[PDB]
Design a protein around this ligand. Structure first.
Ligand SMILES: [Cl-]
Ligand SMILES: [Cl-]
Lengths: 161, 159
């Protein structure tokens, strides 16, 4: 009862990405089939312009069913999908969040976890027992599956380590 | 009696890529679901070290059931590069006359598919459809390339 269903997730993504494209449902249906039901999700925006495409700074909100909601910031290497001045949107599924404070830290990518279908892509990052699945669209769908590192923080920071 | 089966292409995929990676069986399925039965496949190798990753030069063989097997070369952009180069398996759809294979192929937007270390996208020239399948780094990066020229003899010129 602390988990989200694929249907709730597909709806949040349809609304956040402004897309009814079948790729969103396909990618969500793939993440759940591989990892089960998340107990949180992050909607936010990323931009890489400050480091001219090579570092991504993101900002969004963590949504849970009974642990409240929280501003979340993140930093990582970028290929420039978010090099657009308005940045680009990302929805991350969060699995196994037991306590909000355990969310912050450094996430290591899982090799061969890239998945792309119909203009929607994700990969998998893990820290301790938390799995993180950043779902991106468009350019980010294809380029974001190359990030193997993401840091999550409670406050915005320039420092990605 | 001209098209290949999904199982046929998968076994060719396992053998050429040297992998029983389930992503091979998974990618070929999606290409067969989206596109049906191809009547050719190209096995070959790529390299972008001469243009430092700025341009790929490829070489292989197109295999058919009746038209014979024909040396094939391709040129296109690259995202980079290793010394040995990297392997590719190209599904060919709607290949009537071998001579209609050669020329410039334009990518299909949003056609990229990537699963378990395997990936393709789709490019087209007239009614022929080309699906270049790669593994590893090429699975992720190759799906960004939306141009390929196929030719009967090698050339430095990509246009
Ligand atoms: Cl976006
Ligand atoms: Cl885009």
């Amino acid at each position: 009862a602390n988990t989200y269903t694929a249907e709730e997730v597909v709806e949040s993504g349809h609304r956040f990405f402004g897309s009814t494209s079948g790729g969103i449902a396909s990618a969500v249906e793939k993440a759940f089939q591989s990892f089960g039901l998340p107990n949180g999700y992050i909607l936010g925006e990323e931009g890489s312009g400050a480091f001219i495409g090579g570092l991504t700074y993101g900002e969004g909100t963590l949504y849970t069913k009974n642990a409240g909601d929280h501003k979340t910031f993140w930093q990582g290497p970028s290929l420039g999908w978010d090099f657009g001045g308005q940045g680009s949107r990302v929805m991350m599924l969060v699995y196994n969040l037991d306590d909000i404070q355990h969310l912050y830290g450094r996430y290591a990518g899982v090799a061969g976890s890239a998945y792309v279908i119909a203009g929607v892509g994700f990969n998998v990052l893990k820290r301790e027992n938390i799995v993180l699945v950043p779902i991106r669209t468009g350019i980010g769908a294809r380029l974001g599956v190359n990030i193997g590192y993401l840091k999550l923080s409670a406050a915005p920071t320039w420092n990605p380590f």
